[PDB]
Design a protein around this nucleic acid. Structure first.
Length: 721
DNA sequence: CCTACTGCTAC
DNA sequence: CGCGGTAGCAGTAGG
């Protein structure tokens, strides 16, 4: 018998027929993987192999209602292809269209997550299915491939970070070699693909049937009721605890504690921001990219996203990055207190909370002039730029001149952990920073929203109420002029529309409603005298949904050292920023003075070079470079590398005399010579001015520059609304 | 009362 | 031109 319901399924020729137990179904993550699976069939044969693509992140079936499951076509499609049913407990794979299930995911953290979900699903929906030994299979591929180029030539495949790392430290210096990030599982030149299948047993790893503590670990990971435990579970994890590359047997308990946990750690890394710059990695890559490029002139979002992605080794879908760019540019009330990117187009409105944004090919963005005032360029050299794909990318964190995480706040959902931080007032933030600068007590700050005209009152510490504005403008007529921040116009619209026309469950309580919004919120509502009175008993704000809470009880972020931390007060966050920022200011000036000192050396020796040539003390025309090089070092001329570091001793390590001989013949003309002397004098003065400052002096200079910049920003934002 | 929803970066 | 589906957490409003 043949199936009909599913097109994309390549059904094993002997599926569910007397041979169904032998047959294997390969579940692929995405069509790229699927393409590889189907290509594999041409090698291993159709008779005993089939494949069906998993659409995306699979539904977690524990914590899901029978109707939500039943509604899920993916899970159903699997149950039909595998001839699966719930009933009793599974004793033998005999009942099924297939006797084996293989999981082809892309060999990244999200791949592991998919595996965990498939496992979770099987263990939960089917009693006694995973007990069958050798039922659940895994198809695996290398992580990084290395090529040995100038010595003895062989290629090394590395299945994890630790193995590639131990080799990198203990073997890589002995060869000339490259590291390639592995791609696809549905990329590799298909002809190598034929080799994976030819000897596939090596790429196949089997999941050991359920054993003690395997069912418990599955629940720990996927049970909606155990978020707190997961938090602890991640604290326990020990770096370098990774599953053994060569075992051929995987116990579920450590698939979860050695592979799934890896995704979880990565989940929080991308979903929860760092306390110092208030960025999630995706956002930080966007800003880095905008710094790399000169994003003073605008380009479109659909173009910016791939450009950032390419230059920051972003390995996820560009669509995710596009939305993030849009997120950084949004300027409607309730979004960004300060947007670092300019919304040049339909970047979404307050009506739907940005969801009404146009697609990326329509909108454009550039840097906000203010952004560089916040993220000072002089600090760039100080950061620790992450090394990825045999290449350098964005820093671990930026260090704005004020804690931007407090300016804009943040929202995220990870694993075990979650986060909410409300926006605050840049002015108040700068006030406290000044207090700290002066050993003064901090003022307490309260959530603050750019362009918002409601009221916010504190009830308990870490708890606030947020009010819109409702006014009685006539006998029987109310007017709404403000909503709680983060309450979208459409939400209240649907609500009023409900009262106006009533409902199956609820009687209408509104006579008429009109919308007169301008650059503001204007709901004109009419109530029958009967409803007016009723509304008074209930409360006008209560009954029109003009009250929202703000919780500061879940303010989570990574600390300076990359450790997830829960902060119990806003000032704690500010204080932790302040001291790292203070440290990096002294650090910035020490770096600048060093750099400036080298420049004065470079200018001085260039001047000596030209002066000597003019004075006819030195001749270069002819005199083969080797013999010119000796003269230079004999005269005390240091070499310079590309960073601009001097060498006086006698490669990038040593430097060159290119800073002299690489000068343009133009440089020998008096007008050039004069300009060179001016530049050197300018550099010496820069050095003299620099030394005359303290860390706090410099910070303070940046702060005032920003304040001025911020004032204009506020004006432009009011002018554009 | 348990439920279902919102927010958000990823598949 | 455009729609939709899943995870994961803390909290709030809905049936």
């Amino acid at each position: 018998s043949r199936i009909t319901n599913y097109p994309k399924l390549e059904d094993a020729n002997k599926a569910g027929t007397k041979e169904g137990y032998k047959c294997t179904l390969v579940l692929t993550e995405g069509d790229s993987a699927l393409s590889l699976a189907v290509a594999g069939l041409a090698v291993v044969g159709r008779d005993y192999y089939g494949c069906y693509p998993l659409r995306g992140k699979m539904l977690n079936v524990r914590e899901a209602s029978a109707d939500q499951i039943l509604k899920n076509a993916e899970i159903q499609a699997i149950k039909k292809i595998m001839g699966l049913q719930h009933r009793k407990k599974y004793e033998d794979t005999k009942s099924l269209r297939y006797g084996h299930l293989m999981i082809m995911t892309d060999q990244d953290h999200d791949g592991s997550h998919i595996k965990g979900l498939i496992i979770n699903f099987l263990e939960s929906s089917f009693p006694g299915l995973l007990d069958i030994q050798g039922f659940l299979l895994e198809f695996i591929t290398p992580i990084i491939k290395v090529s040995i180029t100038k010595p003895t030539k062989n290629t090394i495949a590395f299945y994890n970070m630790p193995d590639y790392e131990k080799w990198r430290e203990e073997e890589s210096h002995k060869f000339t070699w490259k590291q390639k990030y592995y791609k696809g599982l549905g990329t590799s030149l298909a002809q190598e693909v034929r080799e994976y299948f030819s000897n596939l047993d090596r790429h196949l790893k089997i999941f050991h049937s359920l054993q003690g503590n395997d069912k418990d670990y599955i629940d720990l990971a996927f049970s909606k009721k155990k978020a707190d435990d997961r938090k602890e579970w991640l604290r326990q994890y020990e770096p370098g605890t990774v599953l053994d590359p060569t075992l051929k047997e995987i116990p579920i308990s450590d698939f979860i504690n050695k592979e799934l946990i890896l995704f979880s750690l990565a989940d929080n890394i991308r979903s929860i921001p760092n306390v110092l710059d208030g960025f999630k990695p995706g956002q930080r890559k966007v800003l880095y990219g905008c710094f790399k490029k000169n994003l003073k002139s605008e380009l479109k979002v659909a173009q910016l996203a791939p450009y950032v992605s390419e230059c920051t080794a972003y390995h996820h879908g560009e669509q995710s990055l596009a939305q993030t760019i849009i997120g950084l540019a949004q300027n409607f009330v309730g979004s960004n207190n300060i947007y670092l990117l300019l919304p040049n187009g339909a970047f979404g409105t307050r009506a739907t909370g940005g969801k009404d944004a146009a697609a990326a090919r329509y909108i454009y963005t550039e840097l906000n002039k203010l952004t560089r005032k916040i993220f000072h360029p002089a600090d760039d050299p100080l950061y620790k730029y992450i090394q990825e794909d045999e290449k350098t990318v964005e820093p671990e964190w930026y260090l704005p001149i004020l804690p931007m995480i407090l300016v804009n706040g943040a929202e995220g959902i990870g694993t075990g952990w979650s986060t909410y931080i409300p926006p605050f007032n840049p002015l108040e933030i700068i006030k406290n920073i000044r207090h700290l600068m002066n050993d003064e007590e901090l003022e307490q700050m309260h959530p603050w929203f750019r362009g918002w005209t409601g009221t916010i009152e504190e009830i308990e510490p870490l708890r606030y109420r947020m009010y819109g504005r409702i006014e009685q403008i006539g006998d029987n007529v109310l007017e709404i002029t403000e909503l709680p921040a983060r309450t979208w116009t459409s939400t209240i619209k649907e609500y009023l529309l409900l009262g106006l026309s009533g409902n199956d469950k609820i009687k209408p309580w509104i006579k008429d409603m009109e919308e007169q919004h301008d650059d503001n919120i204007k709901f004109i509502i009419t109530l029958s005298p009967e409803e007016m009175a009723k509304t008074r008993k209930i409360g006008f704000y209560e009954r029109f949904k003009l009250i929202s809470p703000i919780s500061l009880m879940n303010m989570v972020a990574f600390d300076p050292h990359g450790k997830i931390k829960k902060y119990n007060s806003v000032n704690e966050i500010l204080s932790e920023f302040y001291y790292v920022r203070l440290e990096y200011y002294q650090k910035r000036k020490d770096h600048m003075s060093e750099r400036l000192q080298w420049e004065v050396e470079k200018y001085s020796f260039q001047v000596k070079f030209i002066k000597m040539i003019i004075e006819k003390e030195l001749t270069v025309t002819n005199k083969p470079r080797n013999a010119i090089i000796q003269e230079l070092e004999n005269l005390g001329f240091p070499r310079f590398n590309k960073e601009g570091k001097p060498y006086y001793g006698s490669e990038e390590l040593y430097g060159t005399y290119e800073y002299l001989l690489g000068m343009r013949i133009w440089s020998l003309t008096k007008e050039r010579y004069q300009k060179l002397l001016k530049q050197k004098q300018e550099k010496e003065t820069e050095l003299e001015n620099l030394l005359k400052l303290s860390a706090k002096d410099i910070w303070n200079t940046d702060l005032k520059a920003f304040e001025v910049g911020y004032q204009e920003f506020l004006q432009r934002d009011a002018e554009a609304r």
